[PDB]
Amino acid sequence: MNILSKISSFIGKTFSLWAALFAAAAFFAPDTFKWAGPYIPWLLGIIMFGMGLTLKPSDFDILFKHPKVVIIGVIAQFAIMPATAWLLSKLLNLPAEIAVGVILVGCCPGGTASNVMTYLARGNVALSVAVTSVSTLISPLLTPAIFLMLAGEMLEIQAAGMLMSIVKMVLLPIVLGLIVHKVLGSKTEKLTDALPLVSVAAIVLIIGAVVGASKGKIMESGLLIFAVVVLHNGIGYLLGFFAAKWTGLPYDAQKTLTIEVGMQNSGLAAALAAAHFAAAPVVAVPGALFSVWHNISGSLLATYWAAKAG
Ligand SMILES: CC(C)(CO)[C@@H](O)C(=O)[O-]
Ligand code: NA
Ligand code: NA
């Protein structure tokens, strides 16, 4: 069974219980998220382990047979979102450590959630999986590279350390997912049945941990960070659509790259912020809020297209 049909079905069927569990957790057991703070890199690693657990060599066919459509998506990813974050930081003159967190999100690759949103938007799913996989696999070099170029003068770099952080949090769990898939063969369908549950649980723990650990600066700047997230996410959609349109790509691919650009692996941003900016928790907040908003705006954008398709 397609993992994207498993994920959307799981969310659509239990979105209420998650909203109630988070609510009761943040109010009657705030420790649930504070205790998970030091495990944000592992929680993300679990998410990426899922991507690798479901990735098959067939998902790269469109790359090897239609390289130019995939190359456009990867270029549009790293050409739009890093620069967009930098511009929003300067035009709004954000605090230094908030701008670093916003730029950090922009320099990350596309989000793994775009595959489901493209599936829900009825775009080119094969393209969505390809661009996200390519951008993710080359992010150990591009994400720290672009990140220091756009925010170098704002803080220390440790670009080499961030590369290894992405290798351990992204490449290694993906590789583990691939070999676990090879070892178990068909028995992996039962492990992927629990992937929607495990992934969502990890996603909410990461968000609540970052939020709860930075509630002082969220009170005074949280609304400003959300606004930046909405604009960053929205501008990515707009430019991702006009990028696919102006290059002459079909409508299904225009929806794919629209979702691909605007949506980010904001969990990686939060994990990198926790590992390389631990003494400045606010650096991780843009990734936490982005992780929330882009799934809201993504599903809403998919719903709009789903309605116009009739
Ligand atoms: C938080 C997350 C896992 C889903 O929104 C995001 O980092 C992504 O799409 O990869
Ligand atoms: Na994708
Ligand atoms: Na993106």
mmCIF file of C-alpha atoms and ligand atoms in Angstrom:
data_model
loop_
_atom_site.group_PDB
_atom_site.id
_atom_site.type_symbol
_atom_site.label_atom_id
_atom_site.label_comp_id
_atom_site.label_asym_id
_atom_site.label_seq_id
_atom_site.Cartn_x
_atom_site.Cartn_y
_atom_site.Cartn_z
ATOM 1 C CA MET A 1 0.000 0.000 0.000
ATOM 2 C CA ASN A 2 1.188 3.511 -0.829
ATOM 3 C CA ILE A 3 2.660 5.123 2.276
ATOM 4 C CA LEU A 4 1.186 8.487 1.265
ATOM 5 C CA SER A 5 -2.318 6.993 1.342
ATOM 6 C CA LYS A 6 -1.512 5.564 4.781
ATOM 7 C CA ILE A 7 -0.354 8.946 6.098
ATOM 8 C CA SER A 8 -3.246 11.057 4.810
ATOM 9 C CA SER A 9 -5.760 8.432 5.944
ATOM 10 C CA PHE A 10 -4.192 8.354 9.414
ATOM 11 C CA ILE A 11 -4.188 12.150 9.751
ATOM 12 C CA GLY A 12 -7.693 12.641 8.370
ATOM 13 C CA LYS A 13 -9.006 10.006 10.773
ATOM 14 C CA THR A 14 -7.242 11.107 13.978
ATOM 15 C CA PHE A 15 -6.501 14.838 13.636
ATOM 16 C CA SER A 16 -8.873 15.515 16.542
ATOM 17 C CA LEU A 17 -7.190 13.111 18.968
ATOM 18 C CA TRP A 18 -3.812 14.707 18.234
ATOM 19 C CA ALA A 19 -5.165 18.204 18.890
ATOM 20 C CA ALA A 20 -6.619 16.915 22.167
ATOM 21 C CA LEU A 21 -3.470 15.011 23.162
ATOM 22 C CA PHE A 22 -1.191 17.995 22.532
ATOM 23 C CA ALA A 23 -3.616 20.265 24.391
ATOM 24 C CA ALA A 24 -3.865 18.008 27.445
ATOM 25 C CA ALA A 25 -0.112 17.377 27.256
ATOM 26 C CA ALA A 26 0.984 21.024 27.177
ATOM 27 C CA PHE A 27 -1.411 21.879 30.035
ATOM 28 C CA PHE A 28 -1.390 18.865 32.390
ATOM 29 C CA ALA A 29 2.042 17.416 31.543
ATOM 30 C CA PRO A 30 4.393 20.073 30.108
ATOM 31 C CA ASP A 31 7.312 17.801 31.035
ATOM 32 C CA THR A 32 6.347 15.479 28.172
ATOM 33 C CA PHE A 33 7.969 17.982 25.805
ATOM 34 C CA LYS A 34 10.732 19.343 28.049
ATOM 35 C CA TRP A 35 12.046 15.811 28.606
ATOM 36 C CA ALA A 36 12.065 15.275 24.827
ATOM 37 C CA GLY A 37 14.134 18.423 24.233
ATOM 38 C CA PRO A 38 17.538 16.714 24.240
ATOM 39 C CA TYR A 39 16.178 14.052 21.845
ATOM 40 C CA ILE A 40 15.089 16.389 19.032
ATOM 41 C CA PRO A 41 17.942 15.118 16.777
ATOM 42 C CA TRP A 42 16.814 11.529 17.371
ATOM 43 C CA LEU A 43 13.130 12.346 16.861
ATOM 44 C CA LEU A 44 14.048 13.902 13.514
ATOM 45 C CA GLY A 45 16.304 10.947 12.737
ATOM 46 C CA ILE A 46 13.293 8.695 13.287
ATOM 47 C CA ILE A 47 11.274 10.783 10.824
ATOM 48 C CA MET A 48 14.017 10.514 8.202
ATOM 49 C CA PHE A 49 14.386 6.803 8.958
ATOM 50 C CA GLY A 50 10.809 6.589 7.702
ATOM 51 C CA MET A 51 11.614 8.366 4.439
ATOM 52 C CA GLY A 52 14.378 5.842 3.800
ATOM 53 C CA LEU A 53 12.180 2.965 4.969
ATOM 54 C CA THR A 54 9.743 3.803 2.147
ATOM 55 C CA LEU A 55 12.186 4.981 -0.537
ATOM 56 C CA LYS A 56 12.574 2.584 -3.468
ATOM 57 C CA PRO A 57 14.891 2.828 -6.500
ATOM 58 C CA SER A 58 11.801 3.356 -8.672
ATOM 59 C CA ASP A 59 11.221 6.754 -7.042
ATOM 60 C CA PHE A 60 14.324 7.966 -8.920
ATOM 61 C CA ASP A 61 13.065 6.906 -12.364
ATOM 62 C CA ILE A 62 11.694 10.366 -13.166
ATOM 63 C CA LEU A 63 15.126 11.762 -12.280
ATOM 64 C CA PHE A 64 16.993 9.445 -14.657
ATOM 65 C CA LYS A 65 14.368 9.774 -17.424
ATOM 66 C CA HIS A 66 13.212 13.393 -16.907
ATOM 67 C CA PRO A 67 16.248 15.010 -15.260
ATOM 68 C CA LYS A 68 15.341 18.540 -16.349
ATOM 69 C CA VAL A 69 11.994 18.601 -14.531
ATOM 70 C CA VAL A 70 13.665 17.335 -11.351
ATOM 71 C CA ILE A 71 16.636 19.683 -11.794
ATOM 72 C CA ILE A 72 14.213 22.612 -12.040
ATOM 73 C CA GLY A 73 12.612 21.598 -8.753
ATOM 74 C CA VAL A 74 15.936 21.275 -6.941
ATOM 75 C CA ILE A 75 17.232 24.607 -8.258
ATOM 76 C CA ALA A 76 13.941 26.335 -7.451
ATOM 77 C CA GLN A 77 14.205 24.902 -3.928
ATOM 78 C CA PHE A 78 17.654 26.254 -3.059
ATOM 79 C CA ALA A 79 17.299 29.387 -5.215
ATOM 80 C CA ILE A 80 14.068 30.679 -3.635
ATOM 81 C CA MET A 81 13.739 29.673 0.013
ATOM 82 C CA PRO A 82 17.239 30.582 1.269
ATOM 83 C CA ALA A 83 17.082 33.985 -0.435
ATOM 84 C CA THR A 84 13.473 34.515 0.662
ATOM 85 C CA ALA A 85 14.410 33.964 4.310
ATOM 86 C CA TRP A 86 17.351 36.358 3.996
ATOM 87 C CA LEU A 87 15.192 39.089 2.451
ATOM 88 C CA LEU A 88 12.416 38.784 5.039
ATOM 89 C CA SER A 89 15.059 39.016 7.775
ATOM 90 C CA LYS A 90 16.508 42.258 6.403
ATOM 91 C CA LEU A 91 13.297 43.987 5.293
ATOM 92 C CA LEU A 92 11.752 43.307 8.716
ATOM 93 C CA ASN A 93 15.061 43.848 10.578
ATOM 94 C CA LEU A 94 14.507 40.802 12.756
ATOM 95 C CA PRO A 95 16.656 40.194 15.840
ATOM 96 C CA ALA A 96 19.935 38.511 14.951
ATOM 97 C CA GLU A 97 19.086 35.143 16.498
ATOM 98 C CA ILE A 98 15.587 35.074 14.996
ATOM 99 C CA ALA A 99 16.953 35.932 11.548
ATOM 100 C CA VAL A 100 19.427 33.060 11.912
ATOM 101 C CA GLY A 101 16.589 30.671 12.712
ATOM 102 C CA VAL A 102 14.544 31.944 9.770
ATOM 103 C CA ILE A 103 17.487 31.694 7.372
ATOM 104 C CA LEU A 104 18.297 28.258 8.785
ATOM 105 C CA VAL A 105 14.808 27.127 7.752
ATOM 106 C CA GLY A 106 15.239 28.592 4.274
ATOM 107 C CA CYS A 107 18.529 26.754 3.716
ATOM 108 C CA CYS A 108 17.084 23.352 4.621
ATOM 109 C CA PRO A 109 15.837 21.080 1.823
ATOM 110 C CA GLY A 110 12.203 20.452 1.024
ATOM 111 C CA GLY A 111 9.957 18.831 3.581
ATOM 112 C CA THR A 112 9.051 15.163 3.631
ATOM 113 C CA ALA A 113 5.430 16.271 4.123
ATOM 114 C CA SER A 114 5.316 17.718 0.591
ATOM 115 C CA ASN A 115 4.979 14.189 -0.795
ATOM 116 C CA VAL A 116 1.625 13.738 0.948
ATOM 117 C CA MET A 117 0.483 17.273 0.119
ATOM 118 C CA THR A 118 1.278 16.712 -3.556
ATOM 119 C CA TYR A 119 -0.607 13.422 -3.233
ATOM 120 C CA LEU A 120 -3.535 15.354 -1.749
ATOM 121 C CA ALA A 121 -3.232 18.103 -4.378
ATOM 122 C CA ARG A 122 -3.183 15.448 -7.135
ATOM 123 C CA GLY A 123 0.024 16.851 -8.568
ATOM 124 C CA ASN A 124 2.968 14.911 -9.957
ATOM 125 C CA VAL A 125 3.732 12.749 -6.931
ATOM 126 C CA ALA A 126 6.688 11.028 -8.605
ATOM 127 C CA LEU A 127 8.248 14.461 -9.128
ATOM 128 C CA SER A 128 7.573 15.524 -5.536
ATOM 129 C CA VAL A 129 9.284 12.426 -4.129
ATOM 130 C CA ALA A 130 12.224 12.899 -6.499
ATOM 131 C CA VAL A 131 12.958 16.583 -5.837
ATOM 132 C CA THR A 132 12.615 16.163 -2.073
ATOM 133 C CA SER A 133 14.912 13.130 -2.115
ATOM 134 C CA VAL A 134 17.558 14.835 -4.261
ATOM 135 C CA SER A 135 17.470 18.084 -2.282
ATOM 136 C CA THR A 136 17.586 16.090 0.960
ATOM 137 C CA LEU A 137 20.525 13.911 -0.100
ATOM 138 C CA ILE A 138 22.623 16.915 -1.196
ATOM 139 C CA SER A 139 21.619 19.044 1.818
ATOM 140 C CA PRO A 140 24.587 17.905 3.971
ATOM 141 C CA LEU A 141 26.650 20.203 1.723
ATOM 142 C CA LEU A 142 24.215 22.805 0.371
ATOM 143 C CA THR A 143 22.288 23.591 3.560
ATOM 144 C CA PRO A 144 25.352 24.453 5.710
ATOM 145 C CA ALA A 145 26.991 26.097 2.687
ATOM 146 C CA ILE A 146 24.192 28.519 1.807
ATOM 147 C CA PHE A 147 23.447 29.016 5.508
ATOM 148 C CA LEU A 148 26.834 30.559 6.313
ATOM 149 C CA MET A 149 26.801 32.661 3.136
ATOM 150 C CA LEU A 150 23.489 34.304 4.051
ATOM 151 C CA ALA A 151 24.054 34.461 7.835
ATOM 152 C CA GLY A 152 27.847 34.293 8.126
ATOM 153 C CA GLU A 153 28.379 37.796 9.505
ATOM 154 C CA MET A 154 25.520 37.269 11.985
ATOM 155 C CA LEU A 155 26.998 34.385 14.010
ATOM 156 C CA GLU A 156 29.702 31.740 14.097
ATOM 157 C CA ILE A 157 29.639 29.118 11.352
ATOM 158 C CA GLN A 158 30.740 25.577 12.267
ATOM 159 C CA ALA A 159 29.666 24.726 8.719
ATOM 160 C CA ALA A 160 31.694 21.511 8.829
ATOM 161 C CA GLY A 161 29.957 20.507 12.055
ATOM 162 C CA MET A 162 26.523 21.152 10.566
ATOM 163 C CA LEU A 163 27.356 18.930 7.587
ATOM 164 C CA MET A 164 28.121 16.016 9.911
ATOM 165 C CA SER A 165 24.970 16.835 11.886
ATOM 166 C CA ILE A 166 22.903 16.419 8.716
ATOM 167 C CA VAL A 167 24.806 13.242 7.828
ATOM 168 C CA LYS A 168 23.924 11.734 11.209
ATOM 169 C CA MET A 169 20.354 13.080 11.335
ATOM 170 C CA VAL A 170 19.360 12.669 7.668
ATOM 171 C CA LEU A 171 21.688 10.498 5.587
ATOM 172 C CA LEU A 172 22.350 7.845 8.234
ATOM 173 C CA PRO A 173 18.689 7.256 9.236
ATOM 174 C CA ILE A 174 17.727 7.152 5.550
ATOM 175 C CA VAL A 175 20.438 4.570 4.852
ATOM 176 C CA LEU A 176 19.230 2.566 7.851
ATOM 177 C CA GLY A 177 15.716 2.702 6.413
ATOM 178 C CA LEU A 178 16.950 1.416 3.059
ATOM 179 C CA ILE A 179 18.778 -1.605 4.491
ATOM 180 C CA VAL A 180 15.962 -2.364 6.944
ATOM 181 C CA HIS A 181 13.780 -2.366 3.829
ATOM 182 C CA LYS A 182 16.184 -4.670 1.973
ATOM 183 C CA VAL A 183 16.502 -7.050 4.933
ATOM 184 C CA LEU A 184 12.793 -7.463 5.683
ATOM 185 C CA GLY A 185 11.633 -7.243 2.064
ATOM 186 C CA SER A 186 7.854 -7.591 2.051
ATOM 187 C CA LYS A 187 7.651 -7.623 5.865
ATOM 188 C CA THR A 188 8.305 -3.857 5.826
ATOM 189 C CA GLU A 189 4.644 -3.197 4.987
ATOM 190 C CA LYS A 190 3.859 -3.909 8.649
ATOM 191 C CA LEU A 191 6.553 -1.515 9.886
ATOM 192 C CA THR A 192 5.294 1.237 7.578
ATOM 193 C CA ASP A 193 1.799 0.762 9.031
ATOM 194 C CA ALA A 194 3.157 2.354 12.225
ATOM 195 C CA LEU A 195 5.120 5.064 10.395
ATOM 196 C CA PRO A 196 2.287 7.646 10.358
ATOM 197 C CA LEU A 197 1.827 7.223 14.114
ATOM 198 C CA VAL A 198 5.551 7.327 14.900
ATOM 199 C CA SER A 199 6.225 10.269 12.580
ATOM 200 C CA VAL A 200 3.355 12.424 13.857
ATOM 201 C CA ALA A 201 4.271 11.682 17.478
ATOM 202 C CA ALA A 202 7.861 12.708 16.740
ATOM 203 C CA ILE A 203 6.713 15.861 14.935
ATOM 204 C CA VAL A 204 4.565 17.060 17.840
ATOM 205 C CA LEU A 205 7.242 16.251 20.429
ATOM 206 C CA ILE A 206 9.821 18.289 18.499
ATOM 207 C CA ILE A 207 7.463 21.264 18.213
ATOM 208 C CA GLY A 208 6.360 21.241 21.845
ATOM 209 C CA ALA A 209 9.936 20.854 23.071
ATOM 210 C CA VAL A 210 11.159 23.885 21.116
ATOM 211 C CA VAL A 211 8.080 25.922 22.047
ATOM 212 C CA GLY A 212 8.171 25.052 25.742
ATOM 213 C CA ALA A 213 11.910 25.736 25.946
ATOM 214 C CA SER A 214 11.574 29.266 24.496
ATOM 215 C CA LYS A 215 8.255 30.519 25.861
ATOM 216 C CA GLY A 216 9.857 33.757 27.065
ATOM 217 C CA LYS A 217 10.911 34.971 23.617
ATOM 218 C CA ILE A 218 7.769 33.521 22.025
ATOM 219 C CA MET A 219 5.677 35.803 24.244
ATOM 220 C CA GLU A 220 7.433 38.921 22.929
ATOM 221 C CA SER A 221 8.352 37.805 19.386
ATOM 222 C CA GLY A 222 6.291 34.684 18.648
ATOM 223 C CA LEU A 223 3.742 36.622 16.606
ATOM 224 C CA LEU A 224 6.511 38.264 14.573
ATOM 225 C CA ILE A 225 8.081 34.862 13.892
ATOM 226 C CA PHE A 226 4.746 33.392 12.797
ATOM 227 C CA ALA A 227 4.178 36.287 10.389
ATOM 228 C CA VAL A 228 7.645 35.707 8.922
ATOM 229 C CA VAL A 229 6.874 31.991 8.604
ATOM 230 C CA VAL A 230 3.611 32.675 6.759
ATOM 231 C CA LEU A 231 5.342 35.067 4.357
ATOM 232 C CA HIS A 232 8.359 32.796 3.864
ATOM 233 C CA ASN A 233 6.048 29.844 3.237
ATOM 234 C CA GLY A 234 3.692 31.883 1.059
ATOM 235 C CA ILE A 235 6.402 33.477 -1.079
ATOM 236 C CA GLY A 236 7.830 30.008 -1.662
ATOM 237 C CA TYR A 237 4.476 28.829 -2.996
ATOM 238 C CA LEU A 238 4.088 31.863 -5.263
ATOM 239 C CA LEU A 239 7.597 31.683 -6.725
ATOM 240 C CA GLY A 240 7.523 27.890 -6.954
ATOM 241 C CA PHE A 241 4.385 28.130 -9.090
ATOM 242 C CA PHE A 242 5.692 30.875 -11.384
ATOM 243 C CA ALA A 243 8.983 28.971 -11.631
ATOM 244 C CA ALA A 244 7.236 25.846 -12.919
ATOM 245 C CA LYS A 245 4.924 27.918 -15.133
ATOM 246 C CA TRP A 246 7.614 30.133 -16.671
ATOM 247 C CA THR A 247 9.752 27.077 -17.478
ATOM 248 C CA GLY A 248 6.777 25.540 -19.292
ATOM 249 C CA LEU A 249 5.906 22.708 -16.904
ATOM 250 C CA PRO A 250 2.475 21.028 -16.841
ATOM 251 C CA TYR A 251 -0.204 21.894 -14.314
ATOM 252 C CA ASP A 252 0.356 18.747 -12.242
ATOM 253 C CA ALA A 253 4.042 19.679 -12.029
ATOM 254 C CA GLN A 254 3.210 23.312 -11.252
ATOM 255 C CA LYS A 255 1.302 22.152 -8.173
ATOM 256 C CA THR A 256 4.138 19.775 -7.267
ATOM 257 C CA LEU A 257 6.890 22.404 -7.292
ATOM 258 C CA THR A 258 4.607 24.991 -5.678
ATOM 259 C CA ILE A 259 4.234 22.689 -2.671
ATOM 260 C CA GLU A 260 7.847 21.519 -2.938
ATOM 261 C CA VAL A 261 9.387 24.992 -2.643
ATOM 262 C CA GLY A 262 7.132 26.472 0.035
ATOM 263 C CA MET A 263 7.304 23.426 2.312
ATOM 264 C CA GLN A 264 10.565 22.859 4.176
ATOM 265 C CA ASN A 265 12.221 20.202 6.302
ATOM 266 C CA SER A 266 11.666 22.614 9.174
ATOM 267 C CA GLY A 267 12.240 19.763 11.617
ATOM 268 C CA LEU A 268 15.832 19.599 10.401
ATOM 269 C CA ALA A 269 16.132 23.353 10.961
ATOM 270 C CA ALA A 270 14.923 22.936 14.546
ATOM 271 C CA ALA A 271 17.267 19.979 15.054
ATOM 272 C CA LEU A 272 20.253 21.898 13.671
ATOM 273 C CA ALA A 273 19.322 24.876 15.852
ATOM 274 C CA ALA A 274 19.247 22.622 18.918
ATOM 275 C CA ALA A 275 22.588 20.997 18.091
ATOM 276 C CA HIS A 276 24.542 24.101 17.012
ATOM 277 C CA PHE A 277 22.724 26.931 18.854
ATOM 278 C CA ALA A 278 21.784 25.240 22.119
ATOM 279 C CA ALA A 279 22.385 28.373 24.218
ATOM 280 C CA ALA A 280 19.951 30.366 22.010
ATOM 281 C CA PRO A 281 16.698 28.366 22.009
ATOM 282 C CA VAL A 282 14.826 30.997 19.972
ATOM 283 C CA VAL A 283 16.919 29.969 16.956
ATOM 284 C CA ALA A 284 14.818 26.786 16.768
ATOM 285 C CA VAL A 285 11.402 28.477 17.079
ATOM 286 C CA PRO A 286 11.005 29.474 13.394
ATOM 287 C CA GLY A 287 11.475 25.832 12.432
ATOM 288 C CA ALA A 288 8.932 24.685 15.011
ATOM 289 C CA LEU A 289 6.295 27.176 13.861
ATOM 290 C CA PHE A 290 7.114 26.563 10.190
ATOM 291 C CA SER A 291 6.666 22.835 10.816
ATOM 292 C CA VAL A 292 3.143 23.658 12.001
ATOM 293 C CA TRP A 293 2.104 26.291 9.475
ATOM 294 C CA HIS A 294 3.351 24.749 6.228
ATOM 295 C CA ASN A 295 1.240 21.636 6.847
ATOM 296 C CA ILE A 296 -1.767 23.903 7.413
ATOM 297 C CA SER A 297 -1.132 26.058 4.347
ATOM 298 C CA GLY A 298 -0.112 22.983 2.357
ATOM 299 C CA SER A 299 -3.295 21.023 3.024
ATOM 300 C CA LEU A 300 -5.344 24.179 2.432
ATOM 301 C CA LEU A 301 -3.553 24.750 -0.878
ATOM 302 C CA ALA A 302 -4.127 21.113 -1.838
ATOM 303 C CA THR A 303 -7.805 21.482 -0.919
ATOM 304 C CA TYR A 304 -8.183 24.590 -3.087
ATOM 305 C CA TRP A 305 -6.730 22.767 -6.095
ATOM 306 C CA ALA A 306 -8.836 19.691 -5.314
ATOM 307 C CA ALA A 307 -11.963 21.862 -5.496
ATOM 308 C CA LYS A 308 -11.005 23.673 -8.710
ATOM 309 C CA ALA A 309 -10.534 20.187 -10.224
ATOM 310 C CA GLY A 310 -14.271 19.851 -10.771
HETATM 311 C C1 LIG B 1 8.256 18.505 10.643
HETATM 312 C C2 LIG B 1 8.309 17.771 9.308
HETATM 313 C C3 LIG B 1 8.900 16.386 9.551
HETATM 314 C C4 LIG B 1 6.887 17.631 8.764
HETATM 315 O O1 LIG B 1 6.272 18.889 8.729
HETATM 316 C C5 LIG B 1 9.175 18.582 8.341
HETATM 317 O O2 LIG B 1 10.469 18.697 8.861
HETATM 318 C C6 LIG B 1 9.263 17.906 6.974
HETATM 319 O O3 LIG B 1 8.336 18.059 6.134
HETATM 320 O O4 LIG B 1 10.262 17.194 6.690
HETATM 321 NA NA NA B 2 8.208 16.243 -2.179
HETATM 322 NA NA NA B 3 10.838 23.820 -0.061
#
